[PDB]
């Protein structure tokens, strides 16, 4: 059963696929989405995004946006992603918590826009995608995994490069 495509309070289910595994005999991932505005800077005109995959960085959220733009010609000014505390590395800010300056929810993400046209366009478009995937989940646009995980995250045993952390320490002390 999939035809339920509207929750209690404004939530939208966005499903997509998972690729081949060598020992699995329709692996399906959901996102939840609402939207909200305020008078502040970047927490205005922004959609909530719940149940996002491992370390969803810029450029494949941007190929998602780009295939929506090359599919339906939507108005879409999004090129940076906000408030994705993926694993749990940035709950507190110990620097400003013990510092002079640098001052001024769980598993959520914060995807802004700039336009009322963009938020209404992406909102009713992804609602229509939610409905069409609810009655037929068959050949939606899907997750092109030109692997960001094995490049942008495999640094656990890669040593920190010398001139890079030299320049980091030098500019930060300066």
């Amino acid at each position: 059963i999939e035809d339920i495509s509207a929750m209690k309070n404004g939530f939208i289910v966005v499903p997509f696929k998972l690729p081949d595994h060598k020992a699995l005999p329709a692996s399906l991932h959901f996102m939840f989405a609402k939207r909200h505005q305020s008078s502040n800077s970047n927490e205005s005109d922004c959609l909530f995004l719940v149940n996002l995959p491992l370390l969803s960085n810029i450029e494949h959220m941007k190929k998602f946006v780009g295939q929506l733009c090359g599919k339906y010609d939507t108005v879409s000014h999004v090129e940076e992603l906000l408030y994705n505390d993926e694993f749990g590395l940035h709950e507190v800010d110990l620097s400003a918590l013990t510092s002079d300056l640098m001052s001024s929810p769980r598993n959520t993400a914060l995807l802004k826009f700039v336009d009322a046209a963009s938020i209404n366009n992406c909102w009713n478009a992804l609602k229509k995608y939610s409905n069409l995937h609810a009655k037929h989940p068959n050949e939606l646009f899907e997750w092109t995994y030109t692997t960001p995980s094995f490049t942008t995250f495999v640094n656990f045993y890669k040593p920190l490069d010398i001139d890079y952390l030299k320049e980091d320490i030098h500019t930060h002390m300066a």
Partner: protein, 1079 residues
């Protein structure tokens, strides 16, 4: 010193059942002794016709070997009537209500003029005893058949007190007048009259027996079987004297019970021979004596615990066996002669008997140090260990009590095959000295064990396993061909507790070689022969030696027992303990040159990376910072002698390869006031150290790795010196502006973030500050606790087979395992590796969390946790347990002088993992008491998992990593770039750490962090077991703060996004991930 008398009254309240289980027993007792009153007399005979009287009759007659012949025994039998009273535990009202069942005592004394004054020749006094009880029990079976109690009671011939030369008749009941509830058996034992002879033939040195050897067993057994009432006469005299006596005897007898010394006998291979009535008569002797100046050591005007104190202080301090004893008389002082009899001795003048001659030199030698150890654990006023000194049965398992246990299979064939199967002597003097062949060869095998080992073990104990102390009426003795002989066992347990300082010393020296060579040197070269050698050393010292070949699997204790068994007592016996080799090759073998022929107490690879660190230590002191080094000092597992695969050079895939090591500088005032600036200043010092090291000492390799262990400071960068000797070190910088900076973070944090920031500071304190004193005390305690390093090595192997080690920290396991070393009581210090490991498992099964903490004082035996500090750790344990009653987040409380807080090492562990540890230890102890130590027993003790776990993600690395991890079934260099170490190392532990760190509210994960310690011979396979929280037992509706991955099917309910989350795990590691299974 206030809870002890309440413990006395409480244990008495559990032990007294003194009407409902005893009055009907007195009723049946009245029945039995009036029946035996009504049994009549019987007159003169001869045994040459009593054999035909017992020819086809249902009754039999016991004896001793040789069986009586009518030629030298032209012998006569008379049957008169004794008048019965009650004796002993029942008559002094000390009944103990076991599940096994205590015995009871009876009186069959003897008149005078039915037997002559020459009972001192060839055991026909006990033959008329045997024929006496034989006719009495045949008339008792006739009275059974005419008093209709045939269906439920059962009469049994038996060996009285496990002595084959005293048979008795025990009634036990088998399934108003039938009964099965309280302790069972009644016996029928004999007595002889008090005054029988002249005064010079009761000292046990005498001889009157056939072809002058003494017969101490004989002229103690006839004396014991004569006097069974003088003991009660002066015992009731002392009962009229003192009021303390019944409480004294009950606490002493359950003491002797839970440490296993029963009053059977020690000669024929049994832990025991010392018992409650010997204990009480020496108690009365020490009451009315005990000094050379007639110092009454006990006064009988006060309570029981102090008399218990006094009598065991006496029998712990004053030696009885090897040099003299105090002797006492009754009809009453006590005084010390200094004549050692090579026997535990105490002597009488009213009876003129040597009471402990039922008990061996080895059993006294181990019981005296049991008494010294219980003095040590009830003369300390700081703790409370009444559970250790009177509750736990330390004898119930065969391997917490002894370090080493071997089989002795004896397929000697028959009694006439003994001549050319038994390699000892078998002659007249030896079998008239030692009565049976069982206690003869038990004494001989203890002697050859003690001479083969000497100071290489502490104490010896032999036991004939499968020994049986009862036999039916259908056979005259036990005659059952068990295990390969007609003797009263099947095989032999030889058991050792070992001096751990001299386990694997591969030379056991004899005397120095003079020209006219000494007699004990002659004994030495007779005992060793082909293996004996004349010897010099590097100091020019001539002696007699024999060398051994140390091995990681087989310790040389096994080979020296093997040689001294297949030379001096048999040739075709078999000696083995495959369990020893089983866990000794469970321990990983390092890829070192000649590492199969190394020992298990060998710490040489640890010394080697300590020397390589000493070279790095010198070349890092001799350089120049702008702010010089105060102290560089190592803190890692290889420095506290704890890593499993002990470090070989050039081993990338060892996660203990990079050793943690901390340097600190001067107390400079120029530290930056902010945490990220401070971390980048410390790494600026590290960058200058790295550039000067790569400038001058070019043979060291160096890079930088970002630390992520301390949460929420992403600037901790550690360097990594790769030594040319082949080791790696994680250098860190400690300042004095870190702990006060974190405390002010605790101060000005947001009000609901204080427990999270305190978790950060506890990880900091566990990593930098307290780890230094941790590795100091463990490195300083490992050289008095010499089995501690291998028992932690396969304890963490065990813990990684069961894969808890990703949650339980290393230092928590180290404290758990140092508990049975710094406090081994009531057991002894582990002198063998299995003894240490199953003492660890037995403790963590037995130990309950919520009521009792685990304090432990990390001090060498003979700085210690005082009474104020002990009550302070009890107080903050009480504060933790009444702030949280059932252990929601703080689940283990272990604490020491290096950590009075307790929270430090046990934070962040989940309740499924902690209950998994306790439950799996209880499963282990239950299985060991089910089956005993066997090869398949140890194999499923170390099998991985297969329990109620819910995920099995199965993993392989593209190359096997035991070649490049140092466990051999060759890496010797570093490549030209320092990033190939990445693909040579495994990702699985930090990948599953990120998985748990993201999924921490929805489910917990796991992995085996050492891939090929446990993952096959090729060293490739690892599992990942997930476990859903008990919160997610249903289907919740979507809220904002529930922290899960969802698949709603209806409007309200959501469920676990199971298929996509383990597919995303499979995508996060799909080169490593090859298989998934749900349970």
């Amino acid at each position: 010193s206030n809870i002890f008398k309440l413990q006395i009254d409480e244990l008495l309240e559990q032990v007294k059942l003194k009407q409902k289980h005893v009055l009907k027993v007195e009723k049946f007792l009245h029945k039995l002794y009036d029946i035996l009153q009504e049994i009549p007399d019987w007159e003169e005979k001869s045994l040459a016709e009593v054999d035909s009287f017992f020819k086809n009759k249902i009754v039999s007659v016991p004896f001793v070997d040789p069986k009586p012949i009518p030629q030298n025994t032209n012998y006569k039998f008379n049957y008169k009537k004794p008048d019965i009273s009650l004796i002993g535990s029942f008559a002094l009202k000390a009944g103990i209500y076991q599940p096994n069942g205590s015995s009871i005592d009876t009186l069959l004394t003897m008149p005078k003029e039915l037997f002559e004054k020459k009972d001192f020749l060839n055991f026909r006094c006990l033959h008329k005893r045997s024929v006496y009880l034989a006719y009495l029990t045949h008339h008792l079976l006739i009275l059974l058949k005419k008093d209709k109690l045939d269906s439920f009671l059962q009469l049994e011939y038996s060996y009285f007190d496990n002595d084959p030369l005293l048979p008795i008749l025990r009634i036990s009941c088998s399934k108003d007048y039938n009964f099965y509830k309280t302790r069972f058996s009644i016996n029928l034992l004999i007595g002889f009259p008090y005054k029988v002879f002249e005064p010079k033939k009761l000292l046990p040195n005498r001889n009157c027996i056939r072809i002058l050897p003494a017969t101490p067993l004989y002229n103690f057994s006839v004396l014991s079987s004569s006097t069974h009432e003088n003991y009660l006469k002066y015992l009731y005299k002392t009962k009229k004297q003192t009021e303390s006596f019944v409480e004294a005897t009950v606490l002493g007898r359950l003491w002797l019970q839970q440490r296993g010394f029963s009053s059977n006998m020690s000669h024929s291979g049994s832990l025991g021979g010392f018992g409650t009535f010997e204990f009480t008569i020496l108690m009365a002797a020490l009451l009315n004596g005990g000094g050379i100046n007639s110092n009454k050591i006990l006064l009988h005007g006060f309570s029981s615990y102090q008399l218990f104190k006094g009598v065991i202080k006496y029998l712990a301090t004053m030696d009885l066996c090897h040099d003299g004893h105090l002797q006492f008389h009754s009809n009453p002082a006590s005084k010390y002669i200094d004549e050692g009899f090579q026997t535990p001795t105490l002597f009488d003048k009213s009876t003129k008997v040597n009471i402990l001659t039922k008990m061996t030199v080895s059993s006294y030698q181990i019981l005296k140090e049991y008494a010294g150890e219980t003095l040590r654990m009830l003369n300390n006023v700081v703790q409370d260990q009444f559970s250790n000194i009177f509750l736990t049965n330390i004898s119930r398992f065969d391997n917490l009590k002894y370090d080493l246990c071997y089989d002795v299979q004896l397929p000697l064939g028959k009694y006439n095959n003994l001549e050319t199967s038994l390699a000892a002597t078998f002659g007249s003097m030896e079998r008239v000295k030692f009565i049976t062949l069982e206690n003869f060869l038990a004494h001989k095998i203890t002697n050859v064990a003690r001479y083969a080992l000497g100071d290489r073990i502490k104490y010896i104990q032999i036991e004939m396993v499968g020994q049986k102390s009862d036999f039916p009426i259908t056979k005259r003795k036990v005659y059952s061909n068990t295990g390969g002989n007609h003797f009263n066992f099947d095989f032999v347990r030889v058991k050792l507790i070992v001096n751990p300082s001299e386990c694997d010393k591969l030379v056991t020296k004899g005397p120095a070689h003079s020209e006219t060579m000494s007699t004990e040197a002659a004994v030495f070269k007779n005992f060793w022969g082909i293996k004996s050698s004349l010897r010099r050393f590097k100091d020019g010292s001539i002696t007699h030696c024999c060398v051994w070949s140390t091995s990681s699997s087989e310790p040389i204790i096994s080979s020296i027992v093997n040689f001294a068994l297949q030379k001096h007592v048999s040739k075709k016996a078999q000696i083995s303990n495959e369990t020893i080799k089983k866990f000794h090759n469970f321990l990983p073998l390092p890829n070192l040159p000649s590492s199969a022929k190394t020992s298990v107490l060998n710490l040489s690879s640890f010394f080697n990376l300590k020397k390589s660190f000493d070279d790095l230590y010198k070349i890092i002191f001799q350089m120049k910072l702008p702010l010089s080094v105060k102290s560089i000092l190592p803190v890692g597992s290889a420095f506290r002698y704890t890593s499993l695969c002990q470090p070989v050079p050039f081993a990338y895939s060892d996660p203990d390869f990079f050793q943690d090591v901390i340097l600190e500088f001067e107390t400079s005032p120029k530290w930056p006031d902010e945490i990220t600036s401070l971390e980048k200043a410390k790494t600026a010092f590290l960058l200058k150290i790295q550039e000067e090291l790569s400038a001058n000492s070019s043979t060291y390799r160096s890079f930088f790795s970002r630390d992520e262990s301390i949460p929420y400071n992403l600037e901790i960068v550690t360097l990594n010196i790769l030594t040319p000797e082949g080791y790696g070190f994680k250098f860190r910088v400690l300042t004095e502006r870190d702990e006060i900076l974190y405390l002010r973070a605790i101060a000005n944090a947001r009000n609901e973030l204080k427990p999270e920031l305190e978790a950060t500071f506890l990880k900091f304190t566990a990593k930098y500050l307290a780890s230094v004193r941790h590795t100091r005390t463990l490195e300083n305690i490992s050289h008095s606790y010499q089995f501690y390093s291998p028992v932690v090595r396969l304890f963490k192997r065990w813990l990684d087979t069961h894969l808890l080690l990703g949650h339980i920290t290393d230092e928590l396991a180290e404290l758990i395992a140092i508990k049975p070393f710094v406090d081994p009581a009531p057991y002894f210090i582990p002198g063998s590796l299995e003894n240490g490991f199953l003492k660890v498992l037995k403790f963590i099964s037995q130990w309950n969390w919520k009521d009792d903490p685990l304090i432990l004082d990390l001090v060498k035996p003979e700085e210690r946790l005082t009474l104020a500090q002990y009550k302070g750790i009890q107080m903050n344990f009480t504060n933790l347990r009444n702030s949280d009653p059932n252990g929601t987040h703080l689940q283990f409380f272990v604490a020491s002088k290096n950590d009075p807080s307790g929270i430090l090492y046990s934070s962040g562990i989940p309740l499924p993992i902690a209950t998994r540890l306790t439950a799996l230890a209880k499963v282990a102890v239950n299985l060991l008491q089910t089956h005993g130590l066997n090869q398949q027993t140890i194999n499923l003790l170390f099998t991985p998992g297969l329990k109620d776990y819910d995920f099995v993600v199965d993993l392989r690395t593209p190359i096997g990593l035991k070649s490049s991890c140092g466990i051999l079934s060759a890496p010797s260099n570093f490549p030209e770039n320092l990033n190939d170490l990445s693909e040579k190392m495994d990702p699985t532990y930090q990948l599953v750490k990120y998985l748990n760190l993201k999924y921490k509210n929805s489910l917990i994960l796991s992995s085996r962090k050492y891939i090929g310690v446990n993952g096959g011979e090729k060293g490739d396979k690892n599992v990942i077991t997930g476990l859903i929280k008990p919160l997610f037992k249903g289907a919740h509706k979507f809220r904002v703060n529930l922290d899960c991955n969802v698949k709603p099917v209806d409007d309200e309910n959501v469920i676990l996004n199971k298929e996509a989350i383990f597919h995303e795990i499979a995508a996060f590691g799909n080169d490593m991930v090859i298989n998934f299974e749900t349970d």
